Design a protein around this ligand. Sequence first.
Ligand SMILES: CCCCOc1ccc(CC(=O)NO)cc1
Ligand SMILES: [Yb+3]
Ligand SMILES: [Yb+3]
Ligand SMILES: [Yb+3]
Ligand SMILES: [Zn+2]
Length: 607
Amino acid sequence: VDTCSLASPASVCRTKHLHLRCSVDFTRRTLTGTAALTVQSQEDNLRSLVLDTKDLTIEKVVINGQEVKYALGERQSYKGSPMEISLPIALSKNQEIVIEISFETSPKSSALQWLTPEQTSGKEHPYLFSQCQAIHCRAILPCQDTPSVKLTYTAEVSVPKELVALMSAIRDGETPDPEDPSRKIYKFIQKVPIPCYLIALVVGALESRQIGPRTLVWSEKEQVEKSAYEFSETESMLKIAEDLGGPYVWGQYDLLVLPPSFPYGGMENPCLTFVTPTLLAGDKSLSNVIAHEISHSWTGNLVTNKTWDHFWLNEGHTVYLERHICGRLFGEKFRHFNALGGWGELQNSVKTFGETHPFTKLVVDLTDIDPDVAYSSVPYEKGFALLFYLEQLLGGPEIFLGFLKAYVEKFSYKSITTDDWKDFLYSYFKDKVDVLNQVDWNAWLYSPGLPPIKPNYDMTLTNACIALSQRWITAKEDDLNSFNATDLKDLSSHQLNEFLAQTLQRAPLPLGHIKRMQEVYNFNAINNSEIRFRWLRLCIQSKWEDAIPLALKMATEQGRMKFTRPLFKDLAAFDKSHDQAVRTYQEHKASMHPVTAMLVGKDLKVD
Ligand SMILES: CCCCOc1ccc(CC(=O)NO)cc1
Ligand SMILES: [Yb+3]
Ligand SMILES: [Yb+3]
Ligand SMILES: [Yb+3]
Ligand SMILES: [Zn+2]
């Protein structure tokens, strides 16, 4: 049972295709159009069905050229409102019909952010983007909003003619709009069956530049050159990923760099990965986010979680593949470094939620829980840890990659649960079942807290980070003079980041240590968003008032939740910055992404 959806389940009927015709209205902040769903009955004598919607205005429902009866049930919070549709003729099993729904979105759609000209780089044109994962596609169009159902789609999108529309699909041409010559119609086709969470749309003043044989980068003009360089390892990562996962089935692999309010690092929208501009460090140092999104082209997008309870399938495998991509490019020692980092991030989350908290389980029960609220590092890092543990248990990365490739082939184009995975794992490694039965499955899959076993990690690149962190934690005032810019000379940006992560785990430090740190290392000057994030948190937690304006500025000039939520939270826990944090949130809230605005609100306990 998909407890996040109110639609008829896949055992009742299945959407096979969506044909979307819509118009982007920036004056009203509405998408208006029709969604034509090809629905296949899985039951005899099917006479009605239910779709998910959220803040949608329904004009009418047409089947076989006539209007039919439908009703909208009462709103169930974050899930939206169920739309029951009365079919004009009962369907037999496997019979397909086309249901055409005339609809309009609310300007408050949780799927969308509408940005004025002034919130953009160019300042002349407005901009729209979507984000459907997990359950926001229902706030764009009526659908069975569950990853247990996969469909193909085609779409025609009318926008002001100076702007460009893109979607999670192959571009299928453009023409002037016949009903309105100030407008253009862009067309799209996604021939590979996808869950509806992977439907994506951006409209804006976009330009493109080619950076590989199957990759354009898109952004506003101001960010094009920088983006093309930042993501130039993209084709080499695709070739590695194809080696590990099998053929890339999606045609194009394009990247879109969003405005700073994009709430996540990246979103694996098929044919068109969306990424945060906070990746634009200038040195390709945050490209592991690209490797991750690329990896979703197999784990997630081809093999998909049947419900959001099994989100770890999607993320943990993706992190496992990601780290392999980075290990092939940068060395196995770097894969171990990144893995060990991930463990530290898992320790942080577990500490934050509490070691008995239900959201620290690998398989989570989402009944009555908003997926946005449960969202954390856990499914990424506990999932990765489980798979790295298995790798070590079963004979090494070469053997485990053979399983992962067979897993992808096996479950391509399907949606699966943790039991499906587990049973395939047992089938594939049947000569090592004895080893597998040593695994504490109940603990790994269903218990809260840190996993019962920690894998083994190479320490080569981590040692320097720990040693410097330890020098600073154990320093007294009379040791502060011995620190110097030369301490950093052999450290990469990744190692600088891990030094701060290590230090931050023991925060607060004395204020005079943090001041010395700025004096000798000049972390204030670093623009790498990961480093800057962790440094500013370290400042605020150690009660440095000078860091307040810097933290507020970072929290609000970009909107990547990973950064914005802990920055606001730290600012709200510091008594000197508390009132300003809340004031700043209230002032920015209307111009924030709707999900981000919601979550920052809960974190700060303000309404
Ligand atoms: C329950 C899930 C809700 C949040 O959705 C999302 C969570 C994370 C991402 C980034 C990435 O590629 N890994 O996920 C994108 C959407
Ligand atoms: Yb075509
Ligand atoms: Yb039209
Ligand atoms: Yb302000
Ligand atoms: Zn992911």
